[PDB]
């Protein structure tokens, strides 16, 4: 549910700003799927280093344009359709973005950001997770 798919993005974005050394302050089966994404993203950002370090040095970011820069890549990546790896990578952007906000100052986007991420999970990719089987599927597939 939107819910669950809110408690999702913090626990993501939290990891991710954790690893990095700063603060995340600005906020089981359950507890199985936010494991398989923690190590999916880390996973997906080893393997694709080259994408992810290109993307994290491209754009600059402002509180206000911090949004259509977010809308802009993230229509990118799903312009085709929806699979489960770039689900990931949808993610994996999200934790880029609040990393590099809170790097520069802008803290105040970290939890605008979680929020644009559970808004475009709960509007425009739920539909095919829960066609594809759900959050379990997930699980069952990066672990098998
Ligand atoms: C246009 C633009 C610039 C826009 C913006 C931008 C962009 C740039 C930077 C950032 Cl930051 C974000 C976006 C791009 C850049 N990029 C390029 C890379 N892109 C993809 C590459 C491959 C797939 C794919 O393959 N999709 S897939 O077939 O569905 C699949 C396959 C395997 C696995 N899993 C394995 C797990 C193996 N492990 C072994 C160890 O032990 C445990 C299991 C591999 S890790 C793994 C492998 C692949 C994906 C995730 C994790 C999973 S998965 O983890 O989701 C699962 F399994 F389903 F859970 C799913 C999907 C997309 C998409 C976009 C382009």
New binding site residues.
């Given amino acids: 549910m939107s819910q669950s798919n809110r408690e999702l993005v913090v626990d993501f974005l939290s990891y991710k700003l954790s690893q990095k050394g700063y603060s995340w302050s600005q906020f089981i089966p359950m507890a199985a799927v936010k494991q398989?994404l923690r190590?999916?993203?880390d996973?997906?950002?080893l393997?694709?280093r080259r994408?992810?370090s290109?993307?994290?040095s491209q754009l600059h970011i402002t509180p206000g344009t911090a949004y259509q820069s977010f809308e802009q890549?993230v229509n990118?990546?799903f312009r085709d359709g929806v699979?489960?790896?770039?689900?990931?990578?949808?993610f994996?952007?999200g934790?880029?973005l609040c990393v590099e906000s809170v790097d520069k100052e802008m803290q105040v986007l970290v939890s605008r950001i979680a929020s644009w991420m559970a808004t475009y999970l709960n509007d425009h990719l739920e539909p095919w997770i829960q066609e594809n089987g759900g959050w379990d599927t997930?699980?069952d597939?990066?672990?098998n």
Avoid: P, Q
């Fill in positions: 398989a190590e999916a993203g996973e997906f950002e393997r694709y994408a992810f290109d993307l994290t890549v990118e990546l699979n489960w790896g770039r689900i990931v990578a949808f994996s952007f934790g880029a997930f699980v597939l990066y672990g």
